[PDB]
């Protein structure tokens with residue numbers, strides 16, 4: 452893991468990418484149904500992706516479970532925000548479920564989460580985020596988000612090296628590399644915030660009682 | 676489409692490959708005929724959506740009228756699901772990898788009436804691919820051929836042109852892999868002859884699915900109902 | 908029309 | 919939990 456070159460790290464991450472999944476082809480119980488069904492199916496692919504994030508299968512099963520429980524909604528969200536980059540004003544949940552901001556209103560308390568997601572998407576667009584940078588960010592999220600609840604920090608340093616390598620290769624000055632690195636990592640703070648808000652929204656939906664999968668339920672539960 | 680080199684054909688087809696999907700297999704319970712048919716048709720339905728978008732990326736396919744596109748997909752869909760399954764299952768002797776969380780042996784195929792004989796044909800096809808050492812580049816070519824060929828005499832010179840291009844591409848891959856000229860046409864024949872078996876299996880599977888529907892074993896999505904209905 | 912006919916038009 | 923199993927199978 453820590454022996455790979457930056458290019459090999461990027462290659463590995465690109466190769467590990469999960470597929471884009473489809474929705475079914477609205478009320479509050481209907482849209483939440485589509486969204487949660489999609490999320491549950493994506494979750495299964497995410498767990499495969501995780502095992503191919505360099506250093507992750509090196510961890511104990513307990514630690515793997517913990518990171519995924521902490522990270523999963525953050526990872527779904529950065530995925531969605533990436534998919535939606537070239538669709539200003541819309542969220543590309545699936546190629547056949549492209550939702551504008553106003554459709555957020557069908558579901559109580561969602562338009563705000565929609566707004567935060569759109570803002571992130573808009574932010575990435577302005578930064579001209581690259582795919583190779585995106586997969587680095589997604590790996591950082593997996594490994595960082597549960598890490599406070601040494602090998603992991605070495606792997607995190609490697610991914611930072613990889614990000615800097617991409618910016619160097621793109622022709623950015625030293626000063627521009629550090630600034631862009633900073634800009635990208637600060638967005639992860641916003642993504643953590645969105646995940647927190649999304650987690651509470653999902654919990655309250657469970658309470659009103661759309662059905663949730665067992666898997667989705669225990670992911671939810673771990674956040675107590 | 677007709678301008679693509681062989682390598683660009685191969686690259687386009689590799690790029691267009693759909694993902695491997697997961698089933699909703701629930702291991703808390705033993706299989707029933709209904710639950711197993713439910714799993715398999717739920718999987719088929721979701722794979723169909725990806726197949727349809729794959730089809731649009733096969734060279735020459737979106738040149739066709741919407742009616743012709745519909746026709747080809749209606750004729751080929753189960754053949755395409757099956758050749759994918761058989762490809763997925765190649766490195767799992769004696770088992771069908773319907774999904775990474777749904778790996779089945781012929782014994783499990785027995786919980787569905789009339790299914791085990793279709794499993795056996797699928798398994799034998801998988802063994803055949805394994806014994807031939809079928810390559811991924813060869814596999815994507817075959818799947819494209821199925822798409823464009825299976826409905827063409829139930830409908831075009833344009834499709835035949837593309838089919839000829841895929842033939843050139845298959846030979847190119849074999850030459851590049853160091854096969855002698857004789858070996859090239861022998862292997863081309865062997866691969867194409869397997870398509871006859873896949874057609875046959877599709878016809879059995881279609882008759883099987885129809886009986887399941889006609890006995891109210893599983894509910895089918897509107898898409899699956901209409902695919903099935905296209906065949907009578 | 909057939910469901911497929913419409914579905915095919917979705918990007 | 920369930921998750922515990924995916925990670926192994």
Ligand SMILES: C[C@]12CC[C@@H]3c4ccc(O)cc4CC[C@H]3[C@@H]1CC[C@@H]2O
Pocket residue numbers: 486487489490493527528530531544564648649650652653656
């Ligand atoms: C979890 C929610 C439903 C599932 C949503 C989803 C579903 C699928 C997906 O790929 C990304 C996202 C991010 C936003 C998530 C939502 C935030 C609140 C809502 O409950």
Ligand SMILES: C[C@]12CC[C@@H]3c4ccc(O)cc4CC[C@H]3[C@@H]1CC[C@@H]2O
Pocket residue numbers: 715716718719722756757759760773793879880881883884885887
């Ligand atoms: C169509 C059947 C269910 C769906 C099956 C399936 C489902 C998914 C898939 O990827 C391939 C196949 C091939 C075998 C199919 C079966 C043959 C008979 C049965 O009814």
Ligand SMILES: [Cl-]
Pocket residue numbers: 472473492696697721
């Ligand atoms: Cl899916």
